[PDB]
Design a protein around this ligand. Structure first.
Ligand SMILES: CCN1CCN(Cc2ccc(NC(=O)c3ccc(C)c(Oc4ncnc5cc(OC)c(OC)cc45)c3)cc2C(F)(F)F)CC1
Length: 386
């Protein structure tokens, strides 16, 4: 609609508490940036998250509870949430700060010419080569000197411009805060694919670094919920990853995980990505490795293997078994035991993602909701009187 609350700039739907903090503390957001999100109690309850500043906490986010007219304090109540937001945007009446502007993830401005992603190569400056490959490099660079970006380049003569840019075409359609955001392209040789920059790089490297080794259990589960949130989006868009693994997850600031993929030249058919044509054995579901049945349910098997990498901080799956032993044992019903330090409840979700019947595996919508509400315990049974 046009008057509904969902159409407002500051309404962010049903995003996690940690996700609201990460987007509010992202660059470009002033002190007093806010958003309205749905809480965990019910669907009719809301929460207000504001970007504040203390000299002890630094730049942090304060969260207020909106319940039911709608109100934050019992003194002042309103008809709708939009009137509550309008009031606290005009009068700092008890809040930690006056509501200034809605939360915006500041993506840079392109040329605006109709390929809205085309930019002049003068605006991109390559700084450091992050990786090399048969078809091109991955660079760390800057766009207009300020914002840091990552650029995928195309080595001439190794790949057609259309087959290389097909990755950019797919990334235009897949737009989500838990997927790598495409920023811009340069369609003349040498071809550029400019995206957001995830400063910590691969999740597998991040887990094996000194910072990742000191990660607690609630932090690992939050990163797992983000990966499931990203795949739940691909589930809604009828896309599949085919290569879901910890090495294909990029980690940014405040443990912000995003879905990524590398080496897409094996999946090119007719300037399109066909997943069923010829993979990592220990991550692909057994029905995909033997019969080529690549579906979103095979990515759920991959996500279960990814959970073992997270809960063990980067351990190889199926230790001591070669690539041939795993495929024979998996078809005999074998899967990995409960990893060291993994709770029983989480290992139950892993076993569900490893059921040999792909249609009996959980959906990513359930996995996201499970991992997001993994530490929020159940409310006690109380009899509601009419
Ligand atoms: C059926 C097949 N299906 C089809 C759909 N397909 C979805 C798909 C397709 C293509 C991409 N594109 C990328 O992933 C990507 C794009 C550009 C760059 C520069 C990039 O690399 C880095 N980007 C950002 N920061 C980096 C930081 C680094 O270190 C500091 C680093 O080190 C080298 C690399 C960094 C990664 C993402 C997805 C997604 F799954 F996400 F939706 C999945 C498979």
């Amino acid at each position: 609609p046009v008057d509904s609350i969902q159409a407002e700039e500051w309404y962010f739907g049903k995003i996690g508490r940690k996700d609201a903090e990460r987007q509010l503390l992202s660059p470009g957001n002033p002190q007093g940036a806010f958003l309205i999100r749905e809480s965990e109690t019910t669907k009719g309850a809301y929460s207000l998250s504001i970007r504040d500043w203390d000299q002890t906490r630094g730049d942090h986010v304060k969260h207020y509870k909106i319940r039911k007219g709608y109100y934050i304090t019992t003194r002042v109540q309103f008809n709708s949430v939009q009137e509550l937001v309008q009031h606290y945007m005009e009068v700092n009446d008890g809040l930690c700060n006056l509501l200034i502007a809605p939360c915006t993830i500041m993506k840079p401005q392109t040329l605006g010419l109709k390929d809205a992603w085309e930019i002049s190569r003068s605006s991109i400056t390559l700084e450091r080569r992050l990786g090399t490959g048969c078809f091109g490099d991955v660079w760390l660079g800057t766009w207009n000197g300020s914002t840091k970006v990552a650029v995928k380049t195309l080595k001439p003569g190794t790949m057609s411009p259309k087959a290389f840019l097909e990755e950019a075409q797919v990334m235009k359609l897949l737009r989500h805060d838990k997927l790598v955001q495409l920023y811009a392209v340069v369609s003349e040789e040498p071809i550029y694919i400019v995206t957001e920059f995830m400063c910590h790089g691969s999740l597998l490297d991040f887990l094996k670094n000194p910072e990742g080794q000191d990660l607690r259990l609630p932090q690992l589960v939050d990163m797992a919920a983000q990966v499931a949130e990203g795949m739940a989006y691909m589930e809604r868009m009828n896309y599949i990853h085919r290569d879901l693994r910890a090495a294909n997850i990029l980690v940014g600031e405040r443990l912000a995980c995003k879905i990524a993929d590398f080496g897409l030249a094996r999946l090119i058919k007719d300037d399109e990505y066909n997943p069923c044509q010829g993979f990592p054995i220990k991550w692909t579901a057994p029905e995909a490795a033997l019969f080529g049945r690549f579906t979103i349910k095979s990515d759920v098997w991959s996500f279960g293997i990814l959970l073992t990498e997270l809960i063990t901080k980067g351990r190889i799956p199926y230790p001591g078994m070669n690539k041939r032993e795993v495929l024979e044992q998996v078809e005999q019903g074998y899967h990995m035991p409960c990893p060291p330090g993994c709770p029983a409840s989480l290992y139950e979700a892993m076993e569900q993602t490893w059921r040999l019947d792909p249609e009996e595996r959980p959906t990513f919508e359930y996995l996201q909701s499970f991992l997001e509400d993994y530490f929020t315990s159940a409310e006690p049974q109380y009899e509601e009187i009419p």
